[PDB]
Write a protein that holds these residues in place. Structure first.
Motif, PDB file in Angstrom:
ATOM      1  N   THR A 101       0.917  -1.104   0.078  1.00 56.83           N
ATOM      2  CA  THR A 101       0.018  -0.190   0.044  1.00 56.83           C
ATOM      3  C   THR A 101       0.888   1.391  -0.046  1.00 56.83           C
ATOM      4  OG1 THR A 101      -1.532  -1.240   1.309  1.00 56.83           O
ATOM      5  CG2 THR A 101      -1.939   1.121   0.995  1.00 56.83           C
ATOM      6  N   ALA A 108      -5.866   5.946  -9.176  1.00 57.01           N
ATOM      7  CA  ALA A 108      -6.407   4.946  -8.408  1.00 57.01           C
ATOM      8  C   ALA A 108      -6.259   3.639  -9.098  1.00 57.01           C
ATOM      9  CB  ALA A 108      -7.803   5.592  -8.193  1.00 57.01           C
ATOM     10  N   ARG A 111      -2.928   2.367  -8.422  1.00 59.02           N
ATOM     11  CA  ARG A 111      -3.140   1.703  -6.926  1.00 59.02           C
ATOM     12  C   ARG A 111      -3.437   0.432  -6.982  1.00 59.02           C
ATOM     13  NH1 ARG A 111      -6.376   1.317  -3.576  1.00 59.02           N
ATOM     14  NH2 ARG A 111      -7.772   3.066  -4.383  1.00 59.02           N
ATOM     15  N   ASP A 112      -4.825   0.328  -7.527  1.00 64.27           N
ATOM     16  CA  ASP A 112      -5.561  -1.105  -7.382  1.00 64.27           C
ATOM     17  C   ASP A 112      -4.599  -2.109  -8.257  1.00 64.27           C
ATOM     18  OD1 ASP A 112      -7.405   0.837  -6.576  1.00 64.27           O
ATOM     19  OD2 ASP A 112      -8.923   0.196  -7.780  1.00 64.27           O
ATOM     20  N   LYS A 113      -3.873  -1.763  -9.267  1.00 64.37           N
ATOM     21  CA  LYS A 113      -3.259  -2.771  -9.982  1.00 64.37           C
ATOM     22  C   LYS A 113      -2.017  -2.950  -9.289  1.00 64.37           C
ATOM     23  CE  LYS A 113      -2.608  -5.581 -13.476  1.00 64.37           C
ATOM     24  NZ  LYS A 113      -2.320  -4.756 -14.806  1.00 64.37           N
ATOM     25  N   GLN A 116      -3.130  -5.397  -6.336  1.00 64.75           N
ATOM     26  CA  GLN A 116      -3.392  -6.787  -6.875  1.00 64.75           C
ATOM     27  C   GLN A 116      -2.244  -7.454  -6.900  1.00 64.75           C
ATOM     28  OE1 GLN A 116      -5.357  -6.782 -10.453  1.00 64.75           O
ATOM     29  NE2 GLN A 116      -6.757  -8.528  -9.807  1.00 64.75           N
TER      30      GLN A 116
ATOM     31  N   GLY E 272     -13.792   3.674  -0.956  1.00 61.22           N
ATOM     32  CA  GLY E 272     -12.705   3.105  -0.914  1.00 61.22           C
ATOM     33  C   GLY E 272     -11.504   3.696  -0.027  1.00 61.22           C
TER      34      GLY E 272
END
Lengths: 335, 427, 76, 306, 335
Positions: A101, A108, A111-113, A116, E272
């Protein structure tokens, strides 16, 4: 197209403290809470001409004239007492967890990729090898940088602090556990599992690391060193300044963190040098060279971009290196 | 005096402007040079100048230093000189005035064209009056001259209705009888430019730095200099100062604020004189303010008596300043622990510890409270007077003459005032 | 850059530089013949005039101390 | 402009982030106009309900601290700033530099009216204290002294003492209360005297040069320093008219449409910081408003000082 | 026609003080009035280049040459003492009344209409939800920020000060109360009632908030960093400067206020992030992106204009957001 984020700041996991160094006697190190701190003193040195000349002033007359007038300067010096033979170095380490994180991320989708990618890393290979190597670097006194080179015997005691009390205690012979090999040991595997639980976010881990090394009676110890910009004559030609917190010699926290990060044995060059600190572009300040050149496809940034943006997962060793960089933290990201 | 020579000057200036823009642009294609020479060499360029003037304005108090998103009315006004004494402002600015420019940052060429001094003075006063030399060199026709004159003169007038934006400051001022006025102030860019010029001359001028070098070698010089300590820098444009004004482009921000600071703006710490025998010479004596005061007293002790009345007056408020600083120093020791005077020690100044720690009487109801109440220690004034006698120059010429008599009399007055201050400390 | 000579004094820069903050720097050391007087770490963007102005105060106090130490004795 | 019947000592007020930008040419301590406006706001909020008048303020500055830093290699100073919120497009907004400082002051408020006899002195002093405890002094909040060793109570003293000795003792004890501080006074007469002296020194000298000379450190060759009588800070002395007085509805984007708006510009005067023992009466330190709206001159000053 | 005001401003309600930082030992939190302050010190750091290269500095020779130049910096650092494991953060909070009253406003009909709108809001549901969320942000240690991240246990003690003494005292476990969920608790409801009474009152309600975080023995604490512009000076400066009031590390008041304002969970984007600080155009500095864009009808200005001028009352959550902006303050109004 999923370009990488412009702001990708990461916070530092494995937070160390400034390592305060004290002195005492071997076989008295069990009751070492009252040991007096090592104090930074001032002494006078007189240096001679011992550097390379620039081929202009190699004539005997100028060399003799320079030798007839040596330079005087004052240096900060730290030694053990003449009746104390061992050095006690004590600091506390905190394992945080949540490495993937970022602290700041303006994109965004990126950040999500990235989350994951780190999550599927953890599912595939959790913080087991990385925590093992951190446990090795805690077990051997690599945070004793020059205090370890000629020590007769080095012992490291690590205590897990739960609710202000020692939940679990470790004791290692730091000279048996070398600085070159990441072997297997049951107590050290327990320490590695605790560090793994700290890195995975499943628990709060705070370790108190104490190192005892026999250097000798009155021998010089090596705390951290501060930078000096101006020498002048108002100060008595202060040439070297050592680090101290409150009249007690200490080692910088970033030096301890660098000694812990020396886990990178996966750089493209030969490991005859051994492990190096985990940094982008694999740089070593003492060697003056960069392993993992950006021209080769093994530096942190290209590996991270291929892993996240183009889904090109590198080798497991390179994944360990990338996750160790994420644990280390940084100001990753372009302008 | 002649319109022909003014036409010659303006044609010359547009000629250097033309060759400069051709050299800077270096147009080798795209027909840029032909368009530049067909639009910046004739009365069409005067038409563009009249177009560009409407976007610019000469002002003396601008609003754009206040939050740059504020859109308000900038003013070119000189306030009247008040009859009240001892105050500065824009009304001192007479012939040493520099006019600000507000508007677009690319149309400022017409500003330097309008601020020309062709025959000896500015074009502004020439175009205000019905001068035969002016009003004809720029136009062959009378109507074109009139419209260009009104355009070039309206640049100093307020454009639009008077408005001060929300982000600008508006401050109520109570009227003497039951009233208020709104008082929206504007930033005096002319004053800060004038003070910036003065401070730049004082800190980086040739004569000033020559005087500094003369002092560095400890030699004589026909004039001295100034130091200007504790200056503060307030920048207005973060990266684009020209978006504010041309004067703010000359000095990129850099308000150069003066230090209106109280004497306690650098409070160091408070310390207890534990293992020392007399605080006035051992702990009180090396605070920088009292050190400066005693050095000034040292210098003034051996001085001529031609202006002896003024010198004695100055030394009177001098020793008054030492006694005031002593009272302040005791007042700031009053914030320490109540019982620091009871600590063990061979030398702790027990005679002065009654005055150094009043708060010990609270914990010691019968040990030292009644002693401090009944004794009322005023020998502390005598000890400080002895310290001052140790701190004055040992000149036998003053002692033989009546100068020491006057000095002792004024010292007696200041010490009896100081003793009266320490007398009623039990209330 | 290059060494600055001010009478008997010499301000020679270090051969290798360093980075203080994010800006390149070199250490400039002041000599009086063979006697090293002071060392200052100065930005690479300084010109020779600024480097000289950095050591002007030390040179001035050397001059003052030399004037007071070797002042001729006075007859009255 | 009037003699107060009593002095109201507001105790040590910890001011958090006061406007350190006092004037377009001076920085440091806030302008006395801020203190006079705060006292007028106290009168407008609680002074009317108590049937009293709160005019005049004594500023002592028990402690000062400005959020400033000195960059390396420079002798001047810069102001520490705050990170404002981002724009609607996610980019950093343009930085507007403002100076913010920490104060600790105690104020002497001049009180005159019938509420002094109508209400007990401790009651009105208290009610003024908890009125001021929810206000601002120079753009900063006021710290109300919770759970320290002991708070400093408010104390109102009537100037009409029973005797000269009683009045003198009361004045000295009130001075002892606000002792670790320096009273702020104005020196317009001193500034004019120095300007005349400068004009005899050399002609065509403006009062701006006299104000600059009284504050700068002057070095004179035989190398001495021209001494100053006191601290001698430059302070804003008020506002002078810059535009004709408009009607309440003429000016676009005004604060309200019930008050006339006139554009002004700062007047810079001389001030002095001095110990409170060097004043004859503590009411001589009080700062008053002097508007005189016919010629502008919206001024604040402390008269009757010397 | 009810034209909107050209000049509009609101005073900052709910304004805290600087969070003074002090250190001590756990289980001695009660006798913490004499705890020594945390001091900001100086230390030297030597790093190596680790930022992204711009495809022209990726040559190995230039990279090695740039590494051979040492990167030296001076940073401000704040640490707990080597025998203290608990960081105590204390600040004072004033909950001012007259919450919906504008500080400056032109149009008198706009005054009456806005005050009528606030009156309708307060007698409809009042500050029940807003003070609940503010009391939650007080109860969890969100104002510690990075100090709250790796603490073993955080306890927040909040005292109501009426005249000079504790009228009512609270004690919370900050790690049990979430940073994204606003539940209901009895002590939390009492604190919310006190805060709402302060917001609806005519004076102010004073609270002191003292949070104890068990960081670790001698660990590194995080005061607020000061914003200083380099302004293109030739000398190298210190890279990190920490904030302190009187030789004691502190956190900025606006930092604490931004922590308290993190109540907005009604922005059109998904939660989120969770709550965000209540700001016009929903800006988040850490995310670099402004939610509640004016292209959607959920920014503060359009919502307020529809609510007060065209009487288009938004949803209850958007009404809470508008009134929270009124609590926050700001300089409003078009030219």
């Amino acid at each position: 197209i999923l370009s990488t984020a412009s702001v990708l700041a990461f916070e530092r996991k494995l937070d160390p403290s400034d390592a305060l160094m004290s002195a005492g006697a071997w076989a008295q190190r069990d009751a070492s809470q009252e040991w007096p701190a090592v104090t930074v003193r001032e002494k006078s040195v007189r240096g001679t001409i011992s550097n390379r000349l620039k081929t202009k002033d190699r004539d005997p007359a100028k060399l003799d004239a320079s030798i007839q007038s040596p330079n005087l300067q004052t240096v900060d010096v730290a030694n053990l007492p003449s009746d104390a033979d061992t050095l006690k170095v004590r600091f506390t380490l905190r394992v945080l967890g949540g490495a993937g994180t970022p602290s700041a991320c303006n994109d965004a989708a990126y950040r999500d990729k990235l989350l994951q990618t780190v999550a599927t890393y953890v599912n595939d290979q959790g913080f087991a090898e990385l925590a093992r190597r951190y446990a090795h670097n805690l077990a051997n006194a690599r945070f004793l940088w020059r205090n370890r080179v000629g020590a007769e015997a080095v012992e490291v005691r690590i205590n897990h602090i739960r609710q202000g009390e020692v939940a679990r205690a470790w004791r290692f012979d730091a000279l048996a556990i070398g600085l070159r090999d990441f072997k297997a040991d049951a107590e050290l595997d327990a320490l590695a599992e605790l560090i793994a639980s700290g890195l995975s976010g499943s628990g709060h881990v705070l370790l108190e690391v104490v190192a005892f090394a026999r250097i000798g009676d009155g021998q010089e110890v090596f705390p951290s060193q501060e930078l000096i910009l101006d020498k002048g004559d108002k100060k008595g030609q202060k040439s070297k300044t050592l680090y101290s917190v409150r009249d007690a010699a200490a080692i910088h926290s970033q030096k301890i963190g660098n000694a812990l990060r020396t886990i990178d044995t996966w750089y493209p060059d030969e490991d005859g040098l051994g492990p190096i600190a985990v940094e982008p572009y694999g740089s070593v300040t003492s060697q003056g060279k960069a392993y993992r050149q950006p021209k080769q496809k093994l530096d942190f940034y290209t590996l991270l971009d291929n892993w996240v943006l183009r889904d090109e997962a590198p080798a497991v060793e390179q994944q360990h290196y990338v996750i160790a960089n994420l644990i280390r933290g940084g100001v990753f990201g372009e302008a | 005096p002649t319109w022909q020579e003014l036409r010659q000057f303006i044609e010359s200036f547009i000629q250097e402007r033309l060759q400069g823009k051709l050299d800077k642009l270096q147009p080798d294609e795209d027909d840029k040079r032909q368009t530049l020479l067909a639009t910046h060499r004739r009365e069409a360029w005067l038409a563009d100048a009249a177009r560009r003037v409407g976007q610019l304005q000469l002002v003396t108090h601008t609003l754009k230093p206040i939050h740059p998103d504020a859109r308000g009315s900038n003013l070119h006004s000189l306030p009247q000189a008040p009859g009240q004494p001892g105050l500065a402002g824009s009304h001192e600015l007479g012939d040493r005035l520099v006019s600000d420019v507000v508007g677009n940052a690319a149309a400022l060429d017409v500003f330097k064209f309008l601020s020309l001094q062709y025959q000896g003075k500015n074009l502004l006063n020439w175009l205000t009056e019905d001068s035969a030399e002016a009003l004809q060199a720029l136009s062959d026709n009378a109507e074109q001259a009139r419209e260009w004159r009104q355009a070039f003169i309206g640049i100093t007038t307020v454009k639009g209705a008077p408005a001060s934006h929300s982000l600008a400051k508006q401050l109520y001022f109570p009227l003497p009888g039951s009233g208020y006025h709104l008082l929206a102030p504007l930033f005096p860019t002319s004053l800060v430019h004038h003070v910036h010029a003065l401070l730049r001359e004082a800190r980086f001028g040739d004569a000033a730095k020559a005087a500094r070098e003369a002092r560095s070698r400890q030699e004589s010089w026909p004039h001295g200099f100034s130091e200007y300590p504790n200056l503060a820098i307030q920048k207005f444009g973060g990266t684009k100062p020209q978006n504010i004004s041309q004067l703010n482009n000359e000095r990129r921000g850099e308000n150069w604020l003066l230090p209106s600071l109280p004497p306690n703006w650098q409070r160091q710490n408070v310390n207890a004189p534990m293992r020392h025998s007399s605080v006035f010479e051992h702990d009180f004596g090396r605070t920088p303010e009292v050190s400066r005061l005693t050095r000034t007293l040292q210098r003034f002790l051996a001085k001529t008596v031609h202006n002896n009345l003024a010198i004695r007056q100055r030394r009177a408020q001098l020793v008054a300043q030492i006694c005031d600083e002593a009272l302040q120093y005791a007042a700031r020791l009053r914030e320490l622990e109540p019982g620091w005077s009871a600590t063990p020690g061979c030398q702790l100044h027990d005679a002065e510890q009654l005055w150094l720690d009043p708060l010990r009487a609270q914990t010691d109801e019968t040990f030292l409270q009644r002693r401090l109440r009944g004794d009322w220690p005023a020998e502390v004034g005598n000890r400080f007077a002895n310290w001052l006698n140790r701190a004055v120059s040992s000149d036998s010429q003053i002692l033989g003459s009546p100068e020491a008599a006057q000095w002792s009399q004024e010292l007696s007055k200041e010490l009896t005032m100081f003793k009266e201050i320490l007398e009623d400390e039990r209330d | 850059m290059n060494a600055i000579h001010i009478g008997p004094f010499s301000i020679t820069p270090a051969a290798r530089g360093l980075h203080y903050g994010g800006l390149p720097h070199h250490q400039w050391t002041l000599y009086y013949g063979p006697r090293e007087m002071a060392i200052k770490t100065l930005p690479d963007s300084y010109t020779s005039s600024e480097v000289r102005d950095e050591f002007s105060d030390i040179i001035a106090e050397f001059v003052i101390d030399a004037r007071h130490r070797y002042a001729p004795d006075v007859l009255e | 402009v009037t003699d107060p019947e009593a002095l109201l000592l507001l105790p040590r007020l910890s001011i958090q982030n006061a406007n350190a930008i006092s004037s377009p040419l001076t920085w440091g301590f806030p302008s006395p106009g801020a203190f006079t406006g705060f006292v007028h706001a106290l009168q407008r909020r609680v002074g009317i309900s108590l049937d009293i008048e709160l005019d005049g303020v004594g500023i002592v500055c028990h402690r000062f601290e400005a959020q400033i830093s000195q960059p390396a290699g420079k002798r001047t100073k810069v102001f520490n700033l705050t990170r404002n919120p981002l724009n609607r497009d996610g980019s950093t907004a343009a930085i507007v530099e403002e100076g913010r400082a920490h104060l600790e002051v105690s104020l002497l408020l001049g009180v005159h009216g019938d509420g002094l006899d109508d209400h007990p002195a401790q009651e009105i002093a208290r009610q003024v204290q908890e009125q001021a405890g929810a206000m601002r002094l120079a753009g900063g909040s006021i710290l109300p002294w919770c759970n320290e060793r002991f708070p400093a109570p408010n104390a109102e003293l009537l100037m009409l003492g029973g005797s000269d000795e009683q009045r003198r003792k009361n004045q000295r004890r009130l001075t002892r209360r606000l002792l670790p501080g320096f009273a702020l006074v104005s020196r317009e007469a001193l500034l004019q005297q120095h300007l005349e002296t400068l004009r005899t020194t050399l002609p065509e000298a403006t009062t701006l040069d006299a104000l600059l000379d009284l504050c700068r450190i002057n070095f004179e060759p035989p190398w001495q320093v021209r001494d100053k009588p006191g601290w001698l800070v430059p302070i804003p002395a008020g506002y002078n008219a810059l535009s004709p007085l408009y009607l309440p509805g003429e000016v676009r984007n005004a604060r309200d449409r019930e008050t006339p708006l006139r554009f002004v510009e700062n007047l810079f005067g001389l001030g002095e910081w001095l110990s409170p023992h060097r004043v004859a009466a503590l009411s001589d330190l009080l700062w008053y408003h002097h508007a005189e709206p016919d010629k502008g001159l919206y001024r604040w000053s402390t008269p009757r000082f010397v």
